[PDB]
Swiss-Prot record:
Ubiquitous. Identified in the spliceosome B complex. Component of the U4/U6-U5 tri-snRNP complex composed of the U4, U6 and U5 snRNAs and at least PRPF3, PRPF4, PRPF6, PRPF8, PRPF31, SNRNP200, TXNL4A, WDR57, SNRNP40, DDX23, CD2BP2, PPIH, NHP2L1, EFTUD2, SART1 and USP39. Interacts with RAD17 and PRPF31. The complex formed by SNU13 and PRPF31 binds U4 snRNA. The complex formed by SNU13 and PRPF31 also binds U4atac snRNA, a characteristic component of specific, less abundant spliceosomal complexes. It comes from the Eukaryota. It comes from Homo sapiens (Human). One of its GO terms (biological process) is ribosomal small subunit biogenesis. This is NHP2-like protein 1. InterPro entries: eL8/uL1-like, H/ACA_rnp_Nhp2-like, Ribosomal_eL30-like_sf, Ribosomal_eL8-like_CS, Ribosomal_eL8/eL30/eS12/Gad45, Ribosomal_eL8/Nhp2. The keyword rRNA processing does not apply. Residues 33-45 are annotated as: Interaction with U4 snRNA and U4atac snRNA. Keywords: Acetylation, mRNA processing, mRNA splicing, Nucleus, Phosphoprotein, Ribonucleoprotein, RNA-binding, Spliceosome. GO terms for molecular function: ATPase binding; box C/D sno(s)RNA binding; RNA binding; U3 snoRNA binding; U4 snRNA binding; U4atac snRNA binding.
Length: 125
RNA sequence: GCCAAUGAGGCCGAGGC
């Protein structure tokens, strides 16, 4: 397939699993926003922990505006390979091009939310 | 069943039938 270079950073097989797993969990803690639109707002509103996007979005440009807003807001972001997998991670029978894990005070997901973020840093070496 | 976060359908935010 040859993953679009514009899709950086890209979660490796392992990190994707965890990524997808936290995504599903946040879903239950009512701490997950799906869709580029909603994702973007979470950023502008400053309530986003990190953003996950799908390298197989088509055309990728549909979301390429997100990393910039992320850089401008200092919110870590990552790309997973499939919008389907991300889809079912969000509990959606449809593909999800991007989602944003929200900031909830007191959430127990914190130790985990921090572990992805940190994982994400390491990706930027 | 079908449509649907590449946006339900009444900015909000995962439902419609």
């Amino acid at each position: 397939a040859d993953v679009n270079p514009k899709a950086y950073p890209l979660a490796d097989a392992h990190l994707t699993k965890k990524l997808l797993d936290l995504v599903q969990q946040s879903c239950n803690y009512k701490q997950l926003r799906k869709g580029a639109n909603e994702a973007t707002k979470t950023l502008n509103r400053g309530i986003s922990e990190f953003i996950v996007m799908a390298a197989d979005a088509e055309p990728l440009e549909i979301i390429l505006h997100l990393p910039l807003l992320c850089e401008d807001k200092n919110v870590p972001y990552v790309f997973v390979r499939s919008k389907q997998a991300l889809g079912r991670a969000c509990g959606v029978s449809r593909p999800v091009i991007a989602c944003s894990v929200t900031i909830k005070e007191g959430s127990q997901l914190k130790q985990q939310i921090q572990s992805i973020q940190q994982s994400i840093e390491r990706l930027l070496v």
